[PDB]
């Protein structure tokens, strides 16, 4: 069939070669690698704080680098910056579009980002002489809804869209310096590495790709899930990451091993994962499910170590502070809860 | 609490007061999601946001059109709309099955299972012209049209053919069968026959949203 036969066959062999290489490299499973360590026991985490200012469901949240300030987006079309220690609303930013599916907290803390069904990433300046939060850069160029956005630095931001592409922008010029292509379905999440030289993205093709930011190429492609990937989170070491999909299973992929190390699922869990996160040490993997409850997984033993029950609707976002003090969980009941 | 901490707390209180004002503005507004096909004609009825006003009630209609053909993810954002407005092309029998499948997926969608659907069979004039002519037959794409007779409750419009009544009500009963095959009364389908020149669609949306929220209040008060 000319190309339709030749390229399909060469690929089919190449995929078989990758599978054989992974089988050869699979010397021993991580589960047995850790079958001797002490059980992490149960991590009972109590709702220490409850932030109630949003008017509808909360789609996303993000922590500041100082592990005290957090931003959050909601269906009411407003962006609210909270002081988690004192529950104070530091800012309330009205949004032009009320369908914002993501928000981002600049590591320097000067700016904030927001985007959604409007296919535009909006950057808001917090520290301005006028005294009010003002939009500074509206990044257009994506042909689909913006699933996620993360600040590389004060002038560079990496966004993932539902147009099957991720982009690296430059807020100064407002143009895409790099476009990452290769995903078959929508890119639902992206996670920046600790060194920020590369990032991973989970798409609706049940695959996650590792992109090198500088060269703009996909270094590796990881498969193993059977449903759309909704959540992605880089391991604190930076040499691994975890994915949360609608199969109701979480999987841990190692960059160097290029394969899944462990699947975090149980037979009675039939609800997809909306968000995942790691602790400072990377021992607990917190996953927010559709069953209105977040589970805390032992990242090395696959056994559920705790439940973050208390949210009365879907847990949409879930993030851990940079200092690991607390876990903030946003849900569709319009409330953010901080757990310690 | 320092003087600055007190001032910050006060500022947060004023932010909360502005949030309460926005709550008053936001609760009174009813959100409607406009879905349909490319040829459905939903434009007459990226994001094309509309805000109309019927009897002092604020409605906000959203026609998402800046995305790709894959809508299994961005459609979950509308889990809390008052109703989903589904527009179909009644004349195009070829894509009628595609419209039925989309309606079935929306109806049985885990998250859109609590959202009522206002159904707008749009191109009624085109459907009537096609039925009167011999251009195509419904039974080709739907063999069950043979064994189907106009419903007793069907109210024909004056001066209309009984065969046009048969066609339009069969097209409406396919959607109705899909809708009442499940859902156990949490959400309801509201079928309407529409024309491109119709001007009462706003009143229809008003009445049907009124019924939707009335039934919601009855159910939440345990009055069925």
């Amino acid at each position, epitope marked *: 069939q000319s190309e339709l036969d030749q390229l399909r066959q060469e690929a089919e062999q190449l995929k078989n070669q990758i599978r054989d290489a992974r089988k050869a490299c699979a010397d021993a499973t991580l589960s047995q690698i850790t079958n001797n360590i002490d059980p992490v026991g149960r991590i009972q985490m109590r709702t220490r704080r409850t932030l109630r200012g949003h008017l509808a469901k909360i789609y996303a949240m993000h922590w500041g680098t100082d592990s005290r300030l957090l931003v959050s987006a909601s269906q009411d079309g407003k962006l609210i910056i909270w002081d988690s220690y004192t529950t*104070n609303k530091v800012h309330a930013i009205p949004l032009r579009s009320s369908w914002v599916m993501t928000c981002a907290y600049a590591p320097s803390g000067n700016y904030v980002a927001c985007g959604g069904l409007d296919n535009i990433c909006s950057i808001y300046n917090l520290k301005t002489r006028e*005294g*009010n939060v003002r939009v500074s850069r509206e990044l257009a160029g994506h042909t689909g809804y913006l699933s996620c956005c993360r600040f590389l630095d004060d002038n560079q931001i990496v966004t993932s869209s539902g147009d099957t592409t991720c982009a690296l922008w430059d807020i100064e010029t407002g143009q895409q310096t790099t476009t990452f292509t290769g995903h078959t379905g929508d890119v639902m999440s992206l996670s920046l590495a600790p060194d920020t030289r590369l990032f991973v993205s989970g798409a609706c093709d049940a695959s996650a790709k590792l992109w090198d930011v500088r060269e703009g190429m996909c270094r590796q492609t990881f498969t193993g899930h059977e449903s759309d990937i909704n959540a992605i989170c880089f391991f604190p070491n930076g040499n691994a990451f975890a994915t949360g999909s609608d199969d109701a299973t979480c999987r841990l992929f190692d960059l160097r091993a290029d394969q899944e190390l462990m699947t975090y699922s149980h037979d009675n869990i039939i609800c997809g994962i909306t968000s995942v996160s790691f602790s400072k040490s990377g021992r607990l993997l917190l996953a927010g499910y559709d069953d209105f409850n977040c589970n805390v997984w032992d990242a090395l033993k696959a056994d559920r170590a705790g439940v973050l029950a208390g949210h009365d609707n879907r847990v949409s976002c879930l993030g851990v502070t940079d200092d690991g003090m607390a876990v903030a969980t946003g849900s569709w009941d319009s409330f953010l809860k901080i757990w310690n | 609490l320092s003087a*600055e901490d007190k*001032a910050a707390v*006060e*500022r947060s209180k004023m932010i909360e007061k502005q949030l309460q004002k926005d709550k008053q503005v936001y609760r009174a507004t009813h959100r409607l999601l406009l879905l349909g096909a490319d040829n459905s004609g939903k434009s007459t009825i990226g994001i094309f946001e509309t805000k109309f006003q019927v009897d002092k009630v604020n409605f906000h209609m959203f026609d998402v059109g800046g995305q790709r053909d894959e809508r299994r993810k961005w459609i979950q954002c509308f889990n809390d709309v008052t109703a989903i407005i589904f527009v179909v092309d009644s004349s195009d029998y070829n894509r009628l099955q595609e419209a039925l499948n989309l309606f079935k997926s929306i109806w049985n969608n885990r998250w859109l299972r609590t959202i009522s659907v206002i159904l707008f069979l749009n191109k009624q004039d085109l459907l009537a012209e096609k039925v009167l002519a011999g251009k195509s037959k419904i039974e080709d794409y739907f063999p069950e049209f043979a064994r189907y007779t106009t419903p007793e409750d069907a109210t024909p419009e004056p001066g209309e053919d009984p065969r046009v009544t048969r066609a339009k009500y069969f097209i409406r009963d396919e959607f109705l069968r899909i809708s009442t095959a499940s859902g156990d009364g949490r959400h309801y389908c509201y079928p309407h026959f529409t024309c491109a020149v119709d001007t009462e669609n706003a009143r229809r949306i008003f009445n049907d949203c009124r019924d939707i929220i009335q039934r919601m209040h009855l159910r939440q008060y345990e009055l069925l």
Partner: single-chain antibody
Amino acid sequence: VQLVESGGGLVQPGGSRKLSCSASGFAFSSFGMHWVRQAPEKGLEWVAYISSGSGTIYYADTVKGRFTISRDDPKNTLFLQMTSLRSEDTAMYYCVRSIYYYGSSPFDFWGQGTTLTVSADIVMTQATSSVPVTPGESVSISCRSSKSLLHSNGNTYLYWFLQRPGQSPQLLIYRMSNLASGVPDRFSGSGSGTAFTLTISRLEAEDVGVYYCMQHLEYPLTFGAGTKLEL
């Protein structure tokens, strides 16, 4: 940003005068406004404060009851109604903006001021009220406070201001350690409770003036007597 003050002038000891502060270039409704006076032979002295939305008003004990303060956010104007003046009220009144949230910089902008002539407190002492310095050499200026300004929340509420001759003062350091916007790194703020110092590296031009230290722990706002950095 621009704050305009008007109304100062010759007033008899018995009478009244209304002070106005026009706002331009910032969200006047979301800022808490202060009135800070300064006599020709005296340093700054905080006189009154009206919060954002007029939800909280404070006055200095010296003019408590005698003065009134108010704002007009729709008109972006700040009003200070003064009745039954005194011969001690001869001073230049400054309109100061300050917004309070976590990580904000209060007292960032000071209005040009209007000159008005009439025909339970924390004391801040600034040693070496007049010293000569040489450009290009580092200097250290220290003001100490009667009560420790640390609020057990890592908040030593001390503020540094620079009053160059012929213009309103500007905020240099807020919280004793944070440099404000538009202020060069050569300035350094450090110290502990009840003892703070200001360090300047590589002294240059546009630094000659009077250096003030102000506490914001509690509201009886008190300013140091001035340091008068001179060449």
